[PDB]
Enzyme design. Sequence first.
Site, mmCIF file in Angstrom:
data_model
loop_
_atom_site.group_PDB
_atom_site.id
_atom_site.type_symbol
_atom_site.label_atom_id
_atom_site.label_comp_id
_atom_site.label_asym_id
_atom_site.label_seq_id
_atom_site.Cartn_x
_atom_site.Cartn_y
_atom_site.Cartn_z
ATOM 1 N N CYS A 85 0.271 -1.401 0.424
ATOM 2 C CA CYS A 85 -0.109 0.042 0.063
ATOM 3 C C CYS A 85 0.723 1.074 0.197
ATOM 4 O O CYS A 85 2.123 1.130 0.691
ATOM 5 C CB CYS A 85 -0.424 -0.010 1.215
ATOM 6 N N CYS B 184 -6.862 -3.470 3.109
ATOM 7 C CA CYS B 184 -7.278 -2.255 3.730
ATOM 8 C C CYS B 184 -7.151 -1.457 1.778
ATOM 9 O O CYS B 184 -8.203 -1.006 1.868
ATOM 10 C CB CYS B 184 -4.915 -1.097 3.900
ATOM 11 N N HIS C 286 4.695 5.569 2.570
ATOM 12 C CA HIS C 286 4.712 6.862 3.195
ATOM 13 C C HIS C 286 5.425 6.519 4.755
ATOM 14 O O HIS C 286 6.503 8.051 4.852
ATOM 15 C CB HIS C 286 3.654 6.725 3.530
ATOM 16 N N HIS D 91 0.330 -3.696 6.398
ATOM 17 C CA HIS D 91 -1.052 -3.458 7.475
ATOM 18 C C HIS D 91 -2.280 -4.386 6.266
ATOM 19 O O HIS D 91 -3.227 -3.922 6.633
ATOM 20 C CB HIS D 91 -1.141 -2.195 7.575
ATOM 21 N N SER E 43 0.453 4.150 2.121
ATOM 22 C CA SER E 43 0.553 4.312 3.360
ATOM 23 C C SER E 43 1.698 2.975 3.706
ATOM 24 O O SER E 43 2.749 4.432 4.504
ATOM 25 C CB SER E 43 -0.654 4.220 4.196
HETATM 26 N N1 LIG Z 1 -7.965 6.445 4.218
HETATM 27 C C1 LIG Z 1 -7.580 5.707 3.999
HETATM 28 O O1 LIG Z 1 -7.898 4.370 5.261
HETATM 29 C C2 LIG Z 1 -6.512 4.857 3.637
HETATM 30 C C3 LIG Z 1 -7.002 3.613 3.166
HETATM 31 C C4 LIG Z 1 -5.277 3.271 2.278
HETATM 32 C C5 LIG Z 1 -4.293 4.754 1.613
HETATM 33 N N2 LIG Z 1 -4.487 5.015 1.821
HETATM 34 C C6 LIG Z 1 -4.014 6.582 1.013
HETATM 35 O O2 LIG Z 1 -4.312 7.262 -0.265
HETATM 36 C C7 LIG Z 1 -3.302 7.190 -0.932
HETATM 37 C C8 LIG Z 1 -3.620 6.091 -2.068
HETATM 38 O O3 LIG Z 1 -2.489 5.013 -1.956
HETATM 39 P P1 LIG Z 1 -2.466 4.049 -2.730
HETATM 40 O O4 LIG Z 1 -3.938 3.776 -4.425
HETATM 41 O O5 LIG Z 1 -2.318 2.952 -2.391
HETATM 42 O O6 LIG Z 1 -1.471 4.631 -3.661
HETATM 43 P P2 LIG Z 1 -0.507 5.062 -5.376
HETATM 44 O O7 LIG Z 1 -1.040 4.161 -6.040
HETATM 45 O O8 LIG Z 1 0.259 5.203 -5.451
HETATM 46 O O9 LIG Z 1 -1.744 5.750 -6.478
HETATM 47 C C9 LIG Z 1 -1.969 7.589 -6.261
HETATM 48 C C10 LIG Z 1 -1.895 7.742 -7.843
HETATM 49 O O10 LIG Z 1 -2.260 9.852 -8.019
HETATM 50 C C11 LIG Z 1 -1.278 9.545 -8.946
HETATM 51 N N3 LIG Z 1 -1.153 10.549 -8.459
HETATM 52 C C12 LIG Z 1 -0.218 11.570 -8.069
HETATM 53 N N4 LIG Z 1 0.164 12.807 -7.773
HETATM 54 C C13 LIG Z 1 -0.671 13.129 -8.460
HETATM 55 C C14 LIG Z 1 -1.247 14.536 -9.208
HETATM 56 N N5 LIG Z 1 -1.286 15.888 -8.310
HETATM 57 N N6 LIG Z 1 -2.908 14.747 -9.446
HETATM 58 C C15 LIG Z 1 -3.637 13.577 -9.776
HETATM 59 N N7 LIG Z 1 -2.947 12.133 -9.511
HETATM 60 C C16 LIG Z 1 -1.546 11.837 -9.219
HETATM 61 C C17 LIG Z 1 -0.355 8.726 -9.115
HETATM 62 O O11 LIG Z 1 0.409 8.569 -9.941
HETATM 63 C C18 LIG Z 1 -1.310 7.639 -8.593
HETATM 64 O O12 LIG Z 1 -1.514 6.938 -9.695
HETATM 65 C C19 LIG Z 1 -2.210 7.657 -0.409
HETATM 66 O O13 LIG Z 1 -1.680 9.164 -0.367
HETATM 67 C C20 LIG Z 1 -2.394 6.010 0.677
HETATM 68 O O14 LIG Z 1 -1.836 6.637 1.785
HETATM 69 C C21 LIG Z 1 -5.681 5.424 2.825
HETATM 70 O O1 LIG Z 2 -3.503 2.797 4.126
HETATM 71 C C1 LIG Z 2 -3.826 2.806 5.437
HETATM 72 C C2 LIG Z 2 -3.176 4.252 6.636
HETATM 73 C C3 LIG Z 2 -4.312 5.921 6.691
HETATM 74 F F1 LIG Z 2 -4.798 5.799 6.401
HETATM 75 C C4 LIG Z 2 -3.440 6.213 7.472
HETATM 76 F F2 LIG Z 2 -4.132 7.499 7.537
HETATM 77 C C5 LIG Z 2 -1.500 5.867 7.945
HETATM 78 F F3 LIG Z 2 -1.521 6.516 8.834
HETATM 79 C C6 LIG Z 2 -1.535 4.890 7.692
HETATM 80 F F4 LIG Z 2 -0.663 4.528 8.023
HETATM 81 C C7 LIG Z 2 -1.851 3.618 7.138
HETATM 82 F F5 LIG Z 2 -1.549 2.425 7.053
HETATM 83 ZN ZN LIG Z 3 -3.258 0.836 2.865
#
Ligand SMILES: NC(=O)c1ccc[n+]([C@@H]2O[C@H](COP(=O)([O-])OP(=O)([O-])OC[C@H]3O[C@@H](n4cnc5c(N)[nH+]cnc54)[C@H](O)[C@@H]3O)[C@@H](O)[C@H]2O)c1
Ligand SMILES: OCc1c(F)c(F)c(F)c(F)c1F
Ligand SMILES: [Zn+2]
Lengths: 374, 374
Positions: free
Chosen positions: B46, B174, B51, B67, B48
């Site tokens: 993921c 996730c 990150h 996770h 995250s």
């Molecule tokens: N809220 C939650 O519970 C939760 C759970 C899982 C992931 N996340 C977050 O969600 C985000 C996406 O996760 P993911 O899908 O695994 O990531 P990922 O696979 O990196 O996808 C992100 C996408 O964003 C695109 N991108 C980057 N910059 C831009 C921009 N300026 N404009 C438009 N597109 C852009 C990028 O090309 C990519 O396809 C991350 O920040 C994670 O940390 C949050």
């Molecule tokens: O991808 C899920 C996910 C989150 F949405 C968070 F906000 C975070 F802090 C983290 F560690 C995480 F794994």
């Molecule tokens: Zn996640």
Amino acid sequence: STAGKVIKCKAAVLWEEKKPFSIEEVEVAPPKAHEVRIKMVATGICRSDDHVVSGTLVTPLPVIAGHEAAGIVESIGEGVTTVRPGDKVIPLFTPQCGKCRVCKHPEGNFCLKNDLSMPRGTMQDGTSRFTCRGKPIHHFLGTSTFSQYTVVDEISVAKIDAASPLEKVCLIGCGFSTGYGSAVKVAKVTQGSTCAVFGLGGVGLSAIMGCKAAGAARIIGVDINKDKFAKAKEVGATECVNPQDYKKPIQEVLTEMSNGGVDFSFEVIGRLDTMVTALSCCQEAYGVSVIVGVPPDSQNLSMNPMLLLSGRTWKGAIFGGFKSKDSVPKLVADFMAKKFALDPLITHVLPFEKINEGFDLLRSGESIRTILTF
Amino acid sequence: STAGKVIKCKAAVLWEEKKPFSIEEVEVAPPKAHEVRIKMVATGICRSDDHVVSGTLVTPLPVIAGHEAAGIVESIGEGVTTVRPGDKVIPLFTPQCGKCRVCKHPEGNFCLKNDLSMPRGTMQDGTSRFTCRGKPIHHFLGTSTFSQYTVVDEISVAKIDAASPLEKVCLIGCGFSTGYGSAVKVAKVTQGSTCAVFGLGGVGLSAIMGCKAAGAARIIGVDINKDKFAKAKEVGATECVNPQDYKKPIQEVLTEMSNGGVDFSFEVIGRLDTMVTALSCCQEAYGVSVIVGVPPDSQNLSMNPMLLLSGRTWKGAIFGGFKSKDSVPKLVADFMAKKFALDPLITHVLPFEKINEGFDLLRSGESIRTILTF
Ligand SMILES: NC(=O)c1ccc[n+]([C@@H]2O[C@H](COP(=O)([O-])OP(=O)([O-])OC[C@H]3O[C@@H](n4cnc5c(N)[nH+]cnc54)[C@H](O)[C@@H]3O)[C@@H](O)[C@H]2O)c1
Ligand SMILES: OCc1c(F)c(F)c(F)c(F)c1F
Ligand SMILES: [Zn+2]
Ligand SMILES: NC(=O)c1ccc[n+]([C@@H]2O[C@H](COP(=O)([O-])OP(=O)([O-])OC[C@H]3O[C@@H](n4cnc5c(N)[nH+]cnc54)[C@H](O)[C@@H]3O)[C@@H](O)[C@H]2O)c1
Ligand SMILES: OCc1c(F)c(F)c(F)c(F)c1F
Ligand SMILES: [Zn+2]
Ligand SMILES: [Zn+2]
Ligand SMILES: [Zn+2]
């Protein structure tokens, strides 16, 4: 008859920011097609009118302000079907055209014909019905209720009960309906919940009324003016807090008091800082915060989006989320049936000619609503 | 037998930020009361997790991250009642203690026992079950799935269907559940609506899936990497746009495309600017925007609260708003019943030993989800 003729009457003209209103003669053109000319009976002094004076709200000057009011139809232009001469009416600062995507949406009320987002200070046709000293004067929100007579678009007026007491129900045209709807319709406050209302003026009082009506168990009023607390408790506040009394930020205080954050919070002031504080004080996973206050023109707030990521909901609304023309007559009917009270909001009454004294009362902190009589 | 004994196994230890994972031997203590030790089968990569490597997310180091995973219970501590040795399980990075005010609330899922808000990098008891080279190693979100074996608190694990394919259903831990729930549960996308999804990774794709399942008529994918567009259309996007193709800001573009703003937007990237853009592109009176992406630690965004005053709703959520322990088994059951697909998210399947190569595939823009197999 005055129908079809220009009317000369007194109005409160604002020529310049940060100056008193000038009560003087204006010329009020007759209504064009789908326009309604109204003899005003009562108008309230809302803080948003004061924002025009202070420049918190930017709208073209010179202007006839006023947006919380009630009156009697003097004449109707061609094609008007929804009011008649002699009807009691409330001008609608948020129109309801009935035709745009927002009007057609079950939860929208910010009709696309509004003059709020990017104010022109005109009628719908882009022109003014007001002249003063031979100069055109701007409208305000399509209503301009600080005048013995105004002209409004049909989509900006609602017919109300012929037996309505206009010196009370003018508050349905802004402050009451805004606060009450913000709680009951926008936030959808639930039975047994804890609420915090920031700002205990007419609109925040009305939000308290709505929280109580919705069955909230705790309603915490927040104001830096402790003189506001007695009336807040009379209308439903269970406790009141003054941020100035505390060493800690009030969001921390409120989170402690509510054993982890409130269910619903309301910003009913108009400050960027209290908007963020009000969000922060609601519970991080399921809290809801509603912005009601009007912020200073063109200024941005700063906040940490982690406040939202945990689960908070942040929303705002104009006019309590109410579809204006549908809702105002119903609100007046409910008032007539004693379903809510307006007297607690009315602290002062003055003749229209004393408008400046009415604004002085609001600015000093002394009044809630002053109702001006024509 | 391993029950009751220290296990020496392979794990991916992150000793310091911005360095590769170190794949090496760790010692895993047996579970204490109300703890579960799990033999991992598959774990997803993921953003995250990345990150943590990049410093976008701050959590105590050294750490065993990971996770999004699935495995099989090796042993249980005293007092565990919800899983038994041999059960297929998914670790829950958002716990569900069942006792706190959030867990008791019908719409809350961000259980107060979480280790996200203020990470300690421990078990619930404030200690670690992991050692490496004689040094204690932190846990991550109570899960630490980048190890052949982990120990989790009972409130951080769900039993799933014994016939589940773990190499697919790990995504329910996730990215699938987050995106899908963000659409179906948090936004509550409506039939016939227009949606915009910013970010077309695994989570954004799952949000598209949810929007489609909810009956959206238009689903506009937004990404700067046009290589993401074909798969976005495969899972439901009706159109895709790249902000880099336009002279104007993409909120203006999306407002024009949707004839005045979208019904629902989703920020699924993790950038402050796109959070604001995403809010702006939703219709100003009745639009809803959901923040899903995780932004850089301790940075605030700037925004004009008039965006909200007009009627917009802004919210965020962890894990798609799902109560984790209640929801995970049902999601897996729904998958087994063919109610949604997971294969579109899986672009690469690598042995665990290739974890670093998996992270390089994500960073280069080449993968959606890499599944690592133990
Ligand atoms: N809220 C939650 O519970 C939760 C759970 C899982 C992931 N996340 C977050 O969600 C985000 C996406 O996760 P993911 O899908 O695994 O990531 P990922 O696979 O990196 O996808 C992100 C996408 O964003 C695109 N991108 C980057 N910059 C831009 C921009 N300026 N404009 C438009 N597109 C852009 C990028 O090309 C990519 O396809 C991350 O920040 C994670 O940390 C949050
Ligand atoms: O991808 C899920 C996910 C989150 F949405 C968070 F906000 C975070 F802090 C983290 F560690 C995480 F794994
Ligand atoms: Zn996640
Ligand atoms: N959204 C709408 O449709 C709508 C309608 C009506 C009014 N408004 C706005 O709502 C706000 C309240 O209007 P009103 O009730 O007529 O105004 P008001 O009577 O001035 O009440 C505001 C209250 O805020 C209190 N206050 C000032 N600063 C602070 C502080 N830092 N912390 C706590 N309390 C403070 C103040 O003492 C006063 O009692 C104004 O910004 C209006 O422009 C919005
Ligand atoms: O008090 C109601 C009211 C508002 F809510 C505004 F947002 C505004 F711009 C304005 F002029 C106004 F009168
Ligand atoms: Zn309309
Ligand atoms: Zn007002
Ligand atoms: Zn809990």
